[PDB]
Amino acid sequence: TIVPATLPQLTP
Amino acid sequence: TIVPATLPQLTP
Amino acid sequence: MDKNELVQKAKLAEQAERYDDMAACMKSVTEQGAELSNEERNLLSVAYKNVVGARRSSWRVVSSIEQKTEGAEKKQQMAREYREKIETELRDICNDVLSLLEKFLIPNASQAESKVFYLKMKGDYYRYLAEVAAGDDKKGIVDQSQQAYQEAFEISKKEMQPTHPIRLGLALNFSVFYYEILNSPEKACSLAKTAFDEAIAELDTLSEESYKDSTLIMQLLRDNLTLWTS
Amino acid sequence: MDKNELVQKAKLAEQAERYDDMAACMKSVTEQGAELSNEERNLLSVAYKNVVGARRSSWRVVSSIEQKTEGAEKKQQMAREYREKIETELRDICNDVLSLLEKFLIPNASQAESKVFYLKMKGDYYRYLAEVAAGDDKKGIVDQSQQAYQEAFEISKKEMQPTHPIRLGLALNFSVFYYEILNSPEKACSLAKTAFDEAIAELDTLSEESYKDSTLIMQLLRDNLTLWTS
C-alpha cells in the first residue's frame, strides 16, 4: 500500500 | 526576509 | 463540458495539484456569466493563487541568486534574463485574473460579501504586479492596488461583521500591502491590530463553524503582528 | 545557445523549481549530439524525474478518487476521463525520454557507467508506461522494461564494483520492478538482498566520500526489504 524507494528520488 | 501571512495561502 | 462538469474537474485538478487545469476550469465557468457560488469563488481564488504563487516564489529565488552573483557578469546577466521571463509570465497571469474581475465578477456582484471578495482579489493582483513593475509604471500600479483594497475596506466596515472571514482576510492582506509594498509599518500594525480587536469583541456571537474560520485568520493577523513587533 | 549556456540555465531552472524549463534545456544539450558529462547526465535525470513525477503523483491521486466513488456514477466517470488526460501527458513525457535514449544517449555512451545509467533509465521509463498501459499492451511494455533493466544489470555485474551507486541504484529499481510490475515478491527480495550483501563485503575498500554515497542507497534497499519482509 505504501511507496517503496526508487532512484532518482523527488526533492520534494 | 521571512513571510508574512496573506490569504489564500499556497498548498505546499 | 457543462459548467457543473467544469466545477467538478476543478475539484479533481485541485486534489491532483494541477493548478493550470484548475484555473482554466474556473476561468471558463466565470466566462459563462452566471454569478459564481461561494464554493466556485473559492476554487477560482485558490486556483490562481497557486498559479501566480509558483512564479512569485521563482522570482524570489532567481532575484536572490542575481544579488549573490556579484562575480560573473554573464551568470548574473543570465539570472536577470531568466527573472524577466518569470516576470512576463506573472504579468500574463495577473492580467488574466484582473480581466476576469473587471469584465464578469465585480460588475455582476450584487451582495457586498462578494464585492469585497473580488475587490480584495483585485488589490492582491495589482500588488503582485507592483512587485515586478517597471520603475516608471510602479506608482500607477501601486495606486490601483490601494484603491481597490480601500474600496473593499470601506464596504466591509459598513456592511460586514468584524468576524467575517472575507473582512478579516482583506485586512490581513491590506496590512501586508502597507508593510511590504508601501513600506509603512506603523499603518500595517494598527490596521491588523484594529481588525483583530474588533473581531475579538464579537467572538461570543459565532457558531461552531464560524468560530473555527474566523479564529484561523485572527491567528494569522497575530502571527504577522508578532513578527512585526519583534 | 551554447551547450555551456544551456547547462547554466538548467541549474537556474532547478533552483527556481521550473522543471519544465530544466528538461527543455537538458533536452537541447542532449540533442547537440555530444556525449553528456556526469553533471549534465545527473541534471537530465533530475529534470525528467520531476516532470514525470508530477503526473505519476496526479495519476495516483485521481485513481484513488475514481475507486472510492462507488456511490456516484457521474463523479467516477469524471475521474476516469481526467485520469486518461493525465495518462496521455505521462506517455508523451516517457516517449520523449525514451526517444532521447535511443537517438542519442545509449548509442553515444562510451563508458559502462553511462551505458548502465541509460539502460536503467530506459527500464524506469518503460515501467512508468507499464503502470498506465492498456491491458493487451501491458505485457509487451513490461518485457521491454525487463530487457533494458536486465542488460544494465548484466553490464554492472561485469564492469562495476558492488558499492558503485549506479549499480546499487539499478538493483533497487530492478527489484522494485519485480515487486510492483511482475508481482514477484521472492525475486524482488532476493535481488535487493543480494545487492546489499555484496555491497557489505567491499565497504572496507571505500573512501569517506563514496561511503555516504553507497550506504545511502544500501539503506534504501534495507528499507524496501523491511517493507516487503515485514
Numbering used by the authors:
A (entry chain F), B (entry chain E): 519 to 530
C (entry chain A), D (entry chain B): 1 to 230
Sentences from the paper on this structure:
The glucocorticoid receptor (GR) is a ligand-dependent transcription factor that plays a central role in inflammation. The GR activity is also modulated via protein–protein interactions, including binding of 14-3-3 proteins induced by GR phosphorylation. 14-3-3 proteins form a family of eukaryotic regulatory proteins that act as dimers, principally heterodimers, which recognize and bind to specific pairs of phosphorylated serine/threonine residues, thus forming part of a regulatory system with kinases and phosphatases. The mechanistic details of the GR–14-3-3 interaction were further resolved by determining the crystal structures of 14-3-3ζ in complex with GR_pT524, GR_pS617, and GR_pT524-pS617.
Peptides centered on the GR residues pT524 and pS617 were found to be the strongest binders with Kds in the low micromolar range. Of note, these two sites belong to the GR LBD. Two GR_pT524 peptides were found to bind the two respective central binding channels of one 14-3-3 dimer in an extended conformation. Details of the interaction showed that electrostatic effects dominated, with pT524 bound in the positively charged pocket of the 14-3-3 monomer made from K49, R56, and R127. We found that T524 of the GR is the most important phosphosite, particularly in association with S617. Upon replacement of the phosphothreonine pT524, the binding to 14-3-3 decreased by 6700-fold, from Kd = 18 nM to Kd = 120 μM. To further understand the role of pT524, a diphosphoserine analogue (GR_pS524-pS617) was synthesized. This peptide showed an 8-fold reduction in potency (Kd = 140 nM), revealing the importance of the singular methyl group of T524. Interestingly, the GR residue T524 was anticipated to be within an intrinsically disordered region (globplot.embl.de), and the crystal structure analysis of the GR LBD placed this residue within a random coil. We also found that the kinase misshapen-like kinase 1 (MINK1), not previously associated with the GR, phosphorylates the key T524 residue and that, in a cellular system, this kinase is required for most of the binding of the GR to 14-3-3.
